[PDB]
Symmetry: D2
Subunit: 256 residues, 4 copies
């Protein structure tokens, strides 16, 4: 709601958030899945209002550690929404043609148009996290990218884009459970490859990067939301709540 | 159930198909929504296998008269499917940058990649219908486009693309009901043209000719009676799930570890 | 030659520039055609060095009034340059697909990659000129675009893009001659559209827009250059001089393998 | 003039053309550089006619062995032409996002628009050469793309694209000097171990080019073999055939008293 919105004052500290926290919903899994169902219908009717009006642009950014629940959020929260009005843009490791330009070049290509909702499955923030943790570029160049993102997102917002960025917060031990479970599942053993366990060895470094990126790039036009994602039912409900409330705030109407 | 697949013999005539025909499903309406639901979940797990394997490409082409059920088919049949594995490419009237190249230029861009299922809301067949119906180009230039489409689809199929093209068949009277409902629907007045209705019979000759020419083995055409939304949604789901299971996809290999 | 660089002090005024000024070249048209040839040869060897090194990005922005000489600058200055290393990106009136996103969306797509030199035949500055003069958007929204351009260009510069922006300055009277000459040329009337005369009627409004745009967006990382373009020989020479000396300033080197 | 166009009869054999042939021009190295200059200038105003008319599309395909002179052809033949009307599309080794679709996906994106001349520095023919020589795909699957390209090029041509395809032919001995010359040039070594592996497979690249040219040579998209052992002769012949082809299109300036 407003507990998880980080304000643009440069005071954000990541240790003030617990991945197992569930204090916003006065209930358990069975009670939230009832609130998730009613929220999902409101999201479906809001998205058809967004597509019909065709004036607003909605950009949902999902960033999290590996197995943090990015795909789970996309699959569950946007169940039933019209496929012609929502699209997922995934930003993996860059190609040679994409590294030949600025890091914002490939991301700007996928910005939502009018009447469209685009979910960034990993976004331009990958260029201030994995590139910072593994030292793929000097510290001098990515220390300046904090200002580029603030101004790039400001340009989007001033031109009619509503920006929501969610950080799915999971604990270090919970990742050890999900990665071990992903290996012991035939139908999920394929997503994991042994190149994703050294990233876990740099757990503390990715958390300092996420703390700094959120402390710097969270603005009023593009706010950051920290989502405790140790409980899938609570993560799916809280992301659904914040997203639906912001869409109704736009006061959109069907064209006459 | 493959009575609705038209075979590559050049002897196809559309009037043999009745939009109200429902002879493939034994039962009524509500009985089909229970068979559709199990097909829908079979489709969801097949698509996750398509995304996981990452070797096949699935292209679903939807062409139909206006209000024929293209938007209804996409929303209902693909309800619940993972958005990261399915994408809708809508092809309206082309822009000046799209007319500067061939008509296949804008269509080829949206072709599915590996592990992806793409639904063509309209497709390259619009360049063998409206340009033929309204005589926007000479007959000599679009007559050759039957061969271009056959060979463009052959190139896709031979390079690992599974092509399914569904023509949602509705009657002329049923369209008059659906379009008038659009005017009397508060949430649907915005999508809504005398010229498309006035040229109904010509559009039927164009769709019949396009299907007669471009229906091949690697890219077959399916005629779907869409006068009853419940029957069209079940049959397209049946043909799609059957072709997806025909590809016999399997999960990839990881190539035990304690994480610690 | 530093007279034509407008400084980042927010007090640039276009009145102190004369389109007929030629004080940087101590000679005439014939003497400049010999200096242009020597500059053109240096540009050819510099562009192949840019392509060979493959690390720098060079973006040349050309903005000017109608018939101000943008196409003349592209053709003459880049005569002989290898087509594999230079590309022209023209930005006309936007499409509905291009208007569905931000105004910088279509411009960012054409940004040069490493080892490439891209000429913007009109650029994102059209969204603070023709959109400002003709009020295609409210004044509240495009006043914010001065900050977007400064920060978008800083993002490009910090990521390895060398930006050169040239404003070809022609007088109102000289444009009257070139537009009438365009009508009396069999091979050039096609360029003339009947909608080019309302812009001619808004001459002063376009000059206030260009003055404000240059005053706001001229920075140390993306500077503006005012080029007196009433004389094609002086316009072609001066743009060639600033471009060659800026490319040589990068001190690029050939990659030696092994 | 016409001795170098291979006719669409499926008969072409590459050993009939030798890179040292210079039988089409009467004169030496000094006489052709003036004939190249007059052809080059006429090309400059012909391209301005192509851009002004804005109705034709011109596609020039350049394929050749390594160091065969493709970049030299681009640099010299198109020296002075307005950059706003001609564009070079280079097709190197494919990326992952480009391999997820068909091999024609990335090339079809760069096809010339109306009023544009596009130079393909390498093209879709690399997908019937380097993948065939190095066995990146089974022999049965690339046997069919000969048919894909023939029909893809017809689709372009029938929709207003004038296609010119040039194969710059150099001998095995001439390449050995240029690769050693590139090694002994301070300003040119960067272009050069990955290039010497192709020299180990010289003959199989020549058989691949022979099959690709013999199969894909059509009356709508013809192949031209250019002896490129002599740079002065190679640069002149492509300029002659291309300028004659542009004048063959018979383009003219468009049509509209106003005073300011």
């Amino acid at each position: 709601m407003k507990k998880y919105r980080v304000q643009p004052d440069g005071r954000f500290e990541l240790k003030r958030f617990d991945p197992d926290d569930t204090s916003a919903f006065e209930g358990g899994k069975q009670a939230a899945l009832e609130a998730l169902a009613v929220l999902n219908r409101r999201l479906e009717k809001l998205q058809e209002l967004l597509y019909a009006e065709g004036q607003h642009k909605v950009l949902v950014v999902l960033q999290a550690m590996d197995a943090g629940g990015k795909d789970g959020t996309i699959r569950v929260v946007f169940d039933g929404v019209n496929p012609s009005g929502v699209r997922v843009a995934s930003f993996g490791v860059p190609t040679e043609q994409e590294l030949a330009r600025d890091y914002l070049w490939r991301v700007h290509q996928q910005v939502p148009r009018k009447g469209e909702l685009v979910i960034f499955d990993r976004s331009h923030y990958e260029d201030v996290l994995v590139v910072r943790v593994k030292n793929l570029v000097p510290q001098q160049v990515w220390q300046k990218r904090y200002r580029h993102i603030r101004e790039f997102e400001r340009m989007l917002a001033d031109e009619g884009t509503t920006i929501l960025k969610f950080f799915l917060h999971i604990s270090k031990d919970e990742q050890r459970q999900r990665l071990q479970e992903r290996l012991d599942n035939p139908e999920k053993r394929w997503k994991f490859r042994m190149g994703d366990l050294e990233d876990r060895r740099l757990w503390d470094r990715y958390q300092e990067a996420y703390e700094a990126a959120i402390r710097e790039t969270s603005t009023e036009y593009a706010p950051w939301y920290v989502i405790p994602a140790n409980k899938n039912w609570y993560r799916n409900w809280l992301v659904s709540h914040i997203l639906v409330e912001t869409l109704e705030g736009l006061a959109m109407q069907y064209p006459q």
